[PDB]
Paper text:
In contrast to the multiple CCD paralogs found in vertebrates, most insect genomes encode a single CCD known as Neither Inactivation Nor Afterpotential B (NinaB). Later studies demonstrated that NinaB not only cleaves carotenoids symmetrically but also isomerizes one-half of its substrate to form a ~1:1 mixture of 11-cis and all-trans RAL products. This enzyme was thus termed an isomerooxygenase.
To bridge this gap in understanding, we report a high-resolution crystal structure of NinaB from the cabbage looper (Trichoplusia ni), revealing the molecular architecture of its active site and details of its membrane-interacting structural elements. The structure was solved by molecular replacement in space group C2, revealing an asymmetric unit composed of eight copies of TnNinaB. The iron center abuts an extended pocket, ~30 Å in length, that runs along the top face of the β-propeller forming the substrate-binding cleft of the enzyme. As compared with the apocarotenoid-cleaving enzyme NdCCD, the proximal active site size of NinaB is much larger owing to the need to accommodate passage of a β-ionone or 3-hydroxy-β-ionone ring during substrate binding. In the TnNinaB crystal structure, three of the protomers in the asymmetric unit (chains B, F and H) exhibited well-defined density for the entire region while three others had partially resolved sequences (chains D, E and G). Residues 118–126 form a variable-length α-helical structure with pronounced amphipathicity. In both cases, 11-cis isomer production was nearly abolished despite robust oxygenase activity as evidenced by WT-level formation of the all-trans isomer product. Mapping Trp17, Phe357 and the other residues impacting 11-cis formation within the TnNinaB active site revealed their clustering within the distal region of the active site pocket.
Author numbering: 5 to 111, 132 to 507
The structure:
């Protein structure tokens, strides 16, 4: 009758928005918002498990729900609107699940629920299939879609492209070249006058370790001189995926875990586009690389690591529903931030040094991205990933130099991925604020807030709180657009 994880309400993930907030909701302000903070926080995430009388069976299948916090002069409004995807249209028309999903068989999907990223002045919602959807940054209307297979011959891609200071976008994905799978880096070059998608081209590539079992990757790294590919022993079975698509099996069965093999860190030259170096580390699974950089002949790769890929199994609806009696659930979610380090001049297949960055589980990490991505940095921000923590909704700041942590948490409160915004006359790396979207657990399922933390102290500066007309689903990733 009793809970193994009494301080954790996993059912914050199991909500369906029943009514869109199309018109801006006025927010109840507490504390003191920074007056200088002006712009739009966009969020994306799962937002509907229901499809007529049917129900999705995995969280990754849940319908993409966009969120908008408009911030100006200490006032904040809230909106949320479903992304108008092909999958949503087809499922709603049929009033049932007619598209095969990651975790659900139909009775490829374009449910771009993972993230939102800027391509110049435009913003696109992503999943890892090749179709992305443009989003109106004011109204959350779904505008045109783009097909990355048509655009640059990507059959799939990560939902976490890298955005350069000059506006250029890089992303990694799979491409079939002369009947063979290759991992490729696509570049979407920014110019005011041009079209980033029209001028998109492949700038690097890499052969998979196993020709018909290419490695899955959710993120990739970039340094001054290299694209960094972390090739983990979780693979997509080409024939498996084809089979499941034909026979209408959930596509998750396409993933294969091979723990007898190690993880490789592969550097592709930004100059030549070819693999130039490769190193080894332990068998691990990862989703989010924190940052990569070169410093005085050393390569640094910071990422949030698991021992295996069981976190995927943890996010089945049934697994979430029954987690309070699951003795292994916390271990499935057991992530640890690690620094992988090696000399750039070291021989090929040298083992990397692997160090823990902090003695606390971290996920959905962010940094002072605009100034520190691909470069030396000191601080990252994340959310606690320990299911069995005293408070599993902790916002964490890690000082990578010292190992010092600073935290913010409140009872029954579940903050999102924190996004860093620098202060107007910023001197230091952590001279700014964190924006986080809050939901609450238990029966407090129709309240959302924008939290603003002081990045130096991790103290709450201010908060805007909203009530939604229907259940408020928990989001995944976002982006801040300054005015
Ligand atoms: Cl607390
Ligand atoms: Fe992600």
């Amino acid at each position: 009758e009793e809970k193994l994880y009494p301080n954790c309400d996993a059912t914050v993930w199991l909500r369906s928005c029943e009514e869109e907030v199309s018109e801006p909701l006025e927010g109840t302000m507490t504390g003191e918002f920074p007056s200088w903070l002006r712009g739009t926080l966009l969020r994306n995430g799962p937002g509907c498990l229901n499809v007529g009388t049917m129900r999705f069976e995995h969280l990754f299948d849940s319908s993409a729900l966009l969120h908008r916090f408009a911030i100006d002069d200490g006032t904040v409004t809230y909106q949320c609107r479903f992304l108008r995807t092909n999958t949503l249209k087809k499922n709603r028309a049929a009033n049932r699940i007619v598209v095969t999903e990651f975790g659900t068989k139909s009775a490829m999907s374009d449910n771009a629920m993972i993230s939102v990223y800027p391509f110049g002045d435009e913003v696109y919602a992503f999943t890892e299939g090749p179709i992305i959807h443009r989003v109106d940054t004011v109204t959350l209307d779904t505008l045109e879609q783009k097909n990355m297979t048509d655009c640059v011959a990507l059959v799939n891609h990560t939902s976490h492209p890298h955005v350069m200071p000059n506006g250029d976008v890089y992303n990694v994905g799979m491409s079939v070249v002369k009947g063979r799978i290759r991992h490729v880096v696509a570049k979407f070059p920014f110019t005011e006058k041009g079209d980033m998608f029209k001028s998109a081209h492949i700038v690097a590539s890499m052969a998979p370790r196993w020709a018909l079992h290419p490695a899955y990757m959710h993120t990739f790294g970039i340094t001054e001189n290299y694209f960094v590919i972390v090739e983990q022993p979780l693979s997509i079975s080409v024939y498996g995926l084809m089979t499941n698509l034909i026979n209408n099996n959930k596509l998750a069965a396409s993933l294969k875990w091979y723990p007898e093999y190690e993880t490789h860190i592969v550097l592709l030259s930004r100059t030549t586009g070819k693999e130039v170096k490769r190193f080894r580390t332990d068998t691990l699974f990862f989703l989010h690389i924190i940052n990569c950089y070169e410093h005085e002949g050393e390569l640094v790769v910071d990422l949030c690591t698991y021992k295996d890929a069981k976190v995927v199994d943890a996010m089945y609806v049934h697994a979430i529903e029954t987690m309070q009696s699951n003795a292994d659930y916390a271990e499935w979610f057991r992530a640890k931030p690690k620094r992988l380090q090696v000399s750039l001049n070291a021989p090929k297949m040298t083992r990397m040094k692997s160090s823990i960055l902090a003695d606390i589980g971290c996920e959905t990490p962010r940094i002072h991205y605009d100034l520190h991505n691909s470069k030396y940095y000191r601080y990252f921000y994340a959310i606690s990933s320990d299911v069995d923590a005293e408070n599993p909704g902790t916002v964490i700041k890690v000082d990578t130099k010292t190992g010092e942590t600073k935290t913010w948490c409140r009872p029954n409160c579940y903050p999102s991925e924190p996004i860093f915004v620098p202060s107007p006359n910023a001197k230091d790396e952590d001279d700014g604020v964190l924006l986080s979207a809050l939901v609450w657990g238990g029966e407090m399922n129709q309240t959302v807030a924008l939290l603003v933390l002081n990045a130096k102290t991790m103290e709450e500066m201010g908060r805007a709180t909203f009530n939604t007309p229907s259940p408020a689903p928990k989001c995944l990733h976002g982006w801040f657009l300054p005015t």
